[model samples]
Target: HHAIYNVEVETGDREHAGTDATITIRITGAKGRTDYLKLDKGSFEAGSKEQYTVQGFDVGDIQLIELHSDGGGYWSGDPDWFVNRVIIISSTQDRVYSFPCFRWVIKDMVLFPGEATLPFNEVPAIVSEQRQKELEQRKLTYQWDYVSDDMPGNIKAKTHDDLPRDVQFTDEKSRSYQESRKAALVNLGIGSLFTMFENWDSYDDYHILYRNWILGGTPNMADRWHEDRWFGYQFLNGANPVILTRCDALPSNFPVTNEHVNASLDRGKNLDEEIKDGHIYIVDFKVLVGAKSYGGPVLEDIGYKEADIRYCAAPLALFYVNKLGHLMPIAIQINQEPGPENPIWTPHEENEHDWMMAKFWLGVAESNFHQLNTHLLRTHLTTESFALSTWRNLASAHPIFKLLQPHIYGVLAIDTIGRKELIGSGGIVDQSLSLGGGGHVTFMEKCFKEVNLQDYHLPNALKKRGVDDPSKLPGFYYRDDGLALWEAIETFIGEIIAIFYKNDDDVKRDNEIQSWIYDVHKNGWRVNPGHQDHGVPASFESREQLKEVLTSLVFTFSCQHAAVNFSQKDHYGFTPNAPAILRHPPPKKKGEATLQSILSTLPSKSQAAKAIATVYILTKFSEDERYLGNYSATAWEDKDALDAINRFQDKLEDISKKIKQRNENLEVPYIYLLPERIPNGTAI
Candidate 1:
């Protein structure tokens, strides 16, 4: 008997994503398979969906579709086509089947029906073979390369040009980023100032650049950059908002006595009383101790003769929640030792210059810690590890792979480019920051050894730092917003995971999942002795455990990355607010600092301009960015899974509204974690 089928194809909407290449497909169903069928009824224009009627032997209940395209087309260019999806309707049986293919088709590929499947599920032998072949090809495409023996390995590619087509930035993203860089240089009037390699003579000279033209209409941070409250505020809300912890006792090396901070504390409470009351907070930058700054042999080897040398400090800063509900800096020590050379600077210091200079030195230390540890190690490198593992082990039809692919989208491409352009020899790190060349690599290696994976979980991280209780730390917007998103993600993950995995046996029986986790722990962690207790499980034991791990992964890629990545311009754009590199050594004595000395310590005009431009470029979001809780048209075909996605999006919408309401009352709004603005991946 003859059967009639209606086939519909849709092309992606991206510019030049359509193709004129002749397309062919084969359909496999429960009853039998069909011969290669040509789809030539209509033109496959960009964003267009076309249908055709085909006659073939009865192939009941479609299960899979095979598609391929000829490399030649009439357009005289690349014949690649970006397919959105394909749908088949059996007119006689009154049934519809969907095969989602949201990918570039440069060669022959197989597509499965839009339902996630476990490895143990009863799929056709050909389906399993296709998946294995795809993963084997990916193993060759995405290899790992290490910067040092101790550091975590990254994507093997060294430059943007070496990246695979899928991971590379889209044409729109590349163009938009370039435009942002040029516009920043023009708006800051730094295109002309770049030739002037002289140090800033006074603080007023720093203001002149931003006074005439404020890029993006952002509120000028220079207006309150010098205030003690603003300095303390940044630790909780600024670019690197992950460092603060409750201090029950001062470190022996710091040695700040009751007399040193009494004036900054509430009137009746002594230092010990304030500690007991949980009013004491501290940020210790001991990681920067003995770190190499950008100077000497490192600078000479880079071949940049005109770049100014920079310095780093290991600063210990103390803050107290004053009676006015403001977090105020009580004491600052520039070095770890308590020697006479490293005098403590306090709000009660007789010289205002001494106190302000101390704050500036602390800012330098914060910048280094933020760049190397908080932003790079925690967000970028960690996400890249999970991404590589997912690609290496999971098949295309695996549920976990489908769940995580969007969150880790473009990480490999960005990190590959980042290694050469941002942290490379003559890149932004060498040109602007204190840790240049080998120092950047060495610092990341040291940090990678010391960090544990469990601490990245939001609740554990906050509770470990003693910042979990919102009542004690009132203005911690990062903690408040992050917790909401964490809960929503966990619930969504739980719902979706239950659909495929019924019990612990289902999880254990799935060979693909076990292999994926094993690869993540082995290759991603590198089995270094330092990570023996790093808390990344060797294998998943239960559905609950799987849900927790997935929640942490999604949270790290989306909310945590957003909190650290997007706030850079607001804090560093003004340069003085958070100086990336200080030129002069920190003050040694009580009255050593003057206005001229402070100005000289700041970066040169050209150096400051470069810093501004770097942050501006990093802050621009792509025009086609997929935000948190946003899924593609073919993300899931399961009816229950689709409902769970809708509920997750609804929760995110509520969170966004609540965050806006909260920001209306604060002096500075912490909008980095707004659900609508946070991208689904670390693409930039």
Candidate 2:
């Protein structure tokens, strides 16, 4: 992130106390420690005006505030004004109370009003028009231009090429070590490996940094970056994580004098119960806090239309039950270790936020949580939508988080999951195994074997897997299982929301809306590498047995115990094609069998394995093969299937349009607590 900072300060006025007293003062710095300087106190002439020196302290990384007195005599705006550590020359002596009462000494104070102060005298009234012009220019300078690292895509390229089976040991020549390594790249072809470690042809100059990291010579990594044990090694280079600097995206508001602080304090103290937190306040522009400038890195230069559009217009999607305005709070939350008995409800110590808010609203009358919620919900984030993520989740330690506001934490994310990247590698050739992915596939197979022939705990059972002892193992989590889970939840919730619409005709609806949620590439929601897809048909007990087993698992997870399956019936097996869920294909037309496309409708890569798809494979409950059995290739050829595919294409087109029209609104979003599980495909 790029950043800038600026600073300012002010001093004393003589008029109070006995009303007819005079005082004189001198200033001195203690040795080389210039931070603490004091103006002396003396006698003020019976009827005269006096002056004190003006001094300003440049401060940084400000994170606290304190109130000096609880005296009922007088108090400024809010108690939080002290967060900037700006000190006035207020001192006490002889205990009878000092003659000079420091009500911020009038001239001595700090101020940081925030970003809304920028002048738009030369800007256009229409926002999108302004933003379009801004984005077009910024596209030339995004972070990618500075950091040349690719994370996900490169991994897949190596994976497809390095399957252990692709290599073979011949009579005499095959046993050589070099031969084995050579065979690893043989199936995918030589050029593909270069695409993984060195993509000069495909990458721009800056991205060459990524290429250098790929060729990193860390031994034993063989190729994947995550496989390395430590940072900076060649093996560690690929998929290696980079550290990002974290900072606030908005300035912590400051006032130049006690009067400003007191004025803002009154606002917070007088807000509504739900809207007031007592800490919120305001300040003036060009007024400096610890530093002259705040939130400069994430924000574009003062006049970029993109910044103007986001800061000015994106607030219409709110429905503040009471129409309260935005919450510009001086938040106070403590960070303390938790006890085993206590669930982590917040990032700070228990009741810390409650205490701050309580003090803030003590004298205030009206305020709004909607405004608070909106400011929070729209912080800069890479994701589009998520289903349900808790506030604790968003207050993550990730570097990208510097883009959010500095206040409270633990609000939930909604609608979609995180973003996606092309199937690229994170670092150079990382051959080191990820921290815990080494034995993933074998474990998945074992867990499936552990399944009981007779179903007991049905859908949601995975969630309850360790109810007997959560301290032990929560439940068996497979990488591929995430897609299945998401599909299950997505379809489940979709049905419920649709039902709400069906049952209430009076309810207003936006039928135009549809969502993609996220990419199969990132594998968020419990995503991991090599978690392994469900079994191939050839790997199943028998076509009939496999059908009974898979159908049981899918149905049980979907409808809970309500879904009944036929144990003796079987309807699928043996296909040299792909499953509808696993096979990747080009977009399709309505009522058509994708020509030359790998529309297998079977996750089966061979004629022998059972097929599974990322789509939640649930249907109306039934007890026969006709009702509950493995899907057949015949359906892929079915006319209705083609219609479904076409409908999907249409849905995508509609979704794209809606995305363009929507704004980032403040709403409690949902995120998949765990990754949704898909079968035999790229999806998790």
Candidate 3:
């Protein structure tokens, strides 16, 4: 006897998610398997659900469903169909089965009944085989390629066009981004700025370009950029907020005496007193000590003379909390080693130009550090490592894999495009930044070797840098907001992990999770024997450890990345505020700098244009961006995990409201960490 099986298919609600191909399905149950049945009743349109009845022999107790497409879709003649899920209800048996497939279907596929499975014993042979095959295909598509011998490996794709279909930006997204970029240039009246290579005549000349332009009617950063208070504000809430650390004692090489900075401190505050009270902070650009600047091979490749190249410095700057609790720069040594050639410039220095020039040099150093370490390495490259390891080891059905999928999406593709168009030889880095060509690679390699995994944990990083106490460093929006987001994410991840892992034994017995950690440790960071401080275990010892790791990954990809990436245009758009490069070498004496010297040292017109465009494009959010609390395409179907997600979303909403209220009285709103604005991943 045969029964009618009502099979309903849903197409994903995204652009180009529909297909015109012939869709066929087969049902497998405890009793037997049914022959492939054609579902041709209605068109499989985007965001549409179609139901078809298949009169077939009763396949009692449904276990699996097989789907296949001949790759003959008529829409643009492409054969891809993004299937959201399929529900099968038996008329006679009163049984229902759900097969979730939130993935593109281009070929034969097998889907198990019910939600995504995590237990290995629960996965059928056919399903596991399919998972293995998919991973094999991904391996071919996302091969590893290194920038240099010392740096971590990255995707092999040379351009955006070469990326996998899933990783590449949608056609609509690309078009919108292109239009927005063009509009920014035209509306800002800076379209011709990129073609002119003339040097800026004066510092005020940079302001004329953006005199009429405003960022959504916000105050122009250039107006307050030269002020000491504004300059200090950037250290706490700017693009490179992670660099400044509490300075209990001065570095021997810096040799900043009490007399050097006492003039800039408050009446009762002295250098030793400030240090003792934990009110003193220091930013040492030691990482750029020997980093090569944009010259020699880079200039030769670009057909530019040595004079067109820029310079870099490993400067050490000191800051003090004054009477009003405002962070003020006290002393700046342009070079690492203090000597007669490298005089320390102070705010009370008779020559105002020297103080300003010193700040500009520190800005250049901060820019380089921010680009290589904060933005590129910590967020982009680090996420890429986790992404590659997840793809290589974790199965699609694994709980951890599903949890991390959204955070890592499109990362490899964006990074691949960045390599060729932004950081490669003769690209944006070479054109504007201090470290260009091989120097960029060298800087990344050195940073990679020096970075510690323990420091990536938000609380650990804040505590280690002595920026954890908000009372000490008030108005530290990055740290304050970051801690809130981190706690929320940690709680959410812990809830999800609890649902899957019952105890420590469950974590240890999970082969896929163990393999994932091993791959992340061995291949991702390439952690060697001597680098055990990386803190990535070969196998997670407990569920808490797993939760901690996942929290860091989620927080880094979303909140931390947003803080660094989105603030670029505001802080860097005004070129003088944080110049990426300085043309002249570090001044030999304090009185040598003047208004003309600063203008000459600044980036040329064409260089500023490129820098502006780069940040502008990076700061623009995509139309399809999924914020931290939103997961429209989530594969998680477990009731417990779903409830955890709901709680997480609620927490994020509260955090957003709190941030909004806090910003009401502030001069500059810290909107980057707002949960509604922070994308789930660093897609831009």
Candidate 4:
């Protein structure tokens, strides 16, 4: 019922509009009748609109016309023709497709040029609900235990005996007790959400204490408590109030209460009223009646908060769910004007809201890189310490996980260091120019220089992360080990290739990944000072170059800029209670960059503005390139790798499909996500 045919357009300066290509269309209807029409081909000549007038025609059952071309260039004297349009005429109906051409033709492989379906409908609500349900239903399949033996003696395992001791408490309702009680309750509430995941559901006090140790930079127990009191540390202990330390006590005579409400009102403070001047005491732990409290906010109730800690702990939480399932997006993504709290950016807009995800599991990809390098590469996996524990556990479980560490880490670095640099006092990018009075070197830049090896050799054991003696932290490699870890990763990838090498595809895929690893090293995206000349080569031409620009631009606009202008001032208190100029006490006119001004400067049509849109364009380009987990993990002999490949491919295809459907709405407009407020401290 299907027939294929070869067709070509006659070249000429034709009289009728789009009459250059001539073709005859044939179709069979539901009643099994054949109908045909000739356009600029037969007696139905040029400049003529003729119809066959057949009834019961179905466009879907195209029983005959099939246009085919192997795609080639026209010879010197050959075709001298052009294809302005392909007109398929059915009796009483005609569909004409236009093409641009002239003289000699240069033919390259052509993809479908069908008219775009637009109006941009989002994913159906039912589909969205189904996706979320699937995401929620996916259970974490493995538990990673912190295994260590000959750990450095300096890193001692803490017991309850090692807990802080001899702390004071105040029975008197002073400003200090009230503040302390309030801080404790708040921190405890936050901690509950942080540890809500299953793997963190350790009922044992000892494990919980160790997890605390891991979170608090792994130092002495009492010291950790003293230094990081703001950490959520709530667990009911035997009635009484203990674990109170030297710095964190009211008055030793103050009777301990097992309830926050039980703590009496301050001398001049009411439950509903704010204390004017009370001791903002730091408590390591407090025993409450109905609730338990341990740990308070670190550093006078400030410094690092949820976002910072979350990024640090991202690698571990990333491995919490199955490698083959939906990996929840760890950070908020927005494509519109952001809210006060989680304000990212919406560089691309049509009205505003969060953009659909690129649909790749970036975190999962990063975690997979972690697993391959530390665990699978070695002859045996060993969780030698709290630091190296999670990777070993995850690698053992998911042998073939998606690998895109370079991109994920890049995002994290930009989000944390880039955002902080823009907002932090004395931080580069804090002012319009750097402290250097030129472009201030960003904190993100400094980190790039620090992490990698010096010329990719001479591993300095003491400087990098993990134990200096491999024996002490056997089979361990921390993130800070830098290029050394990358080299090992390359070796492991080769090992995988050898294990699964079956055909040309295997070899090709292996070679491409190998090239990718090397390319990443040179791309400057992985290293610092990349934007500089002689750093990485980007002429700002190729799609790859465009992506490179976007990576930096998107991170700056979408993530960092918001953190600086919005969250830092409003959320982090970096600018006190005012704009940058006023906060810095630098009285000026029209000074310092704001999120809005940065955006408005790039007037979408201008090259400057296009740079921002190009940033989003690169987002699409990268969706096909660097974040190529689906392709890299495909066709593997190993079952685990295959599952991983299948899962990622499905996700990638869905992303591609959605982006295609919304193609018309997808424009990388030159946009700015900054300067929302007037500059020069005019907030008054």
Whole-model Cα lDDT per candidate?
Answer: 0.81, 0.20, 0.79, 0.23
Candidate 1 lDDT tens digits, 195-243 = 3564566665666555434346553466788789998988888898888
Off by over 4 Å in 3: 73-76, 121-142, 180-190, 193-199, 210-220, 297-306, 528-533
- Tens digits of per-residue lDDT for model 2, 1-684: 111111112112212211211211221221111232332343223222333443433222221111222211243332111111122231211111012112222222212121111112122232223323433432232111101111111111122112111111111222222332333235224323444553223102112222212111212222221211111121001110011111112122211222212322333342233223322222111101111111121111121111101011000000011113322222211111112211112112243433222111110100011111111111111111111111112111111111111111101111011112111132100111110121212222222222232322223333332112212211112212222433443333333233223333212121111101122112211223433332212222222332233333333332221111110001111111101111221111212222222223212121111111100011111111111111221112223334443543344344333323321231211111111111111011
Poorest lDDT segment (10 consecutive residues) of candidate 2: 310-319
Task: Residues 503-593, candidate 4: write the lDDT tens digits.
Answer: 4443234322233223333432333333322233322223333223223322222222222222111111111111111111111121333
Clashes of each: 0, 101, 0, 25
Give the winner by lDDT: 1
Q: State the lDDT of candidate 3 residue by residue for 250-319, as single tens digits.
A: 9988888888877777748678888988888999887787777776422121112246767777788998
Candidates sorted on lDDT, descending = 1, 3, 4, 2
Model 4 C-alpha RMSD to native: 27.3
Give per-residue lDDT, candidate 1, residue 93. 67
TM-scores for every predicted model: 0.95, 0.18, 0.94, 0.22
Q: Which wins on lDDT, candidate 2 or candidate 4?
A: 4
The candidate that achieves the highest TM-score relative to the unseen native structure? 1
Error of 4 at 507 (Å): 5.6
Model 2 segments more than 4 A misplaced: 1-272, 275-334, 338-635, 663-684
Q: Is candidate 3 or candidate 4 better by TM-score?
A: 3
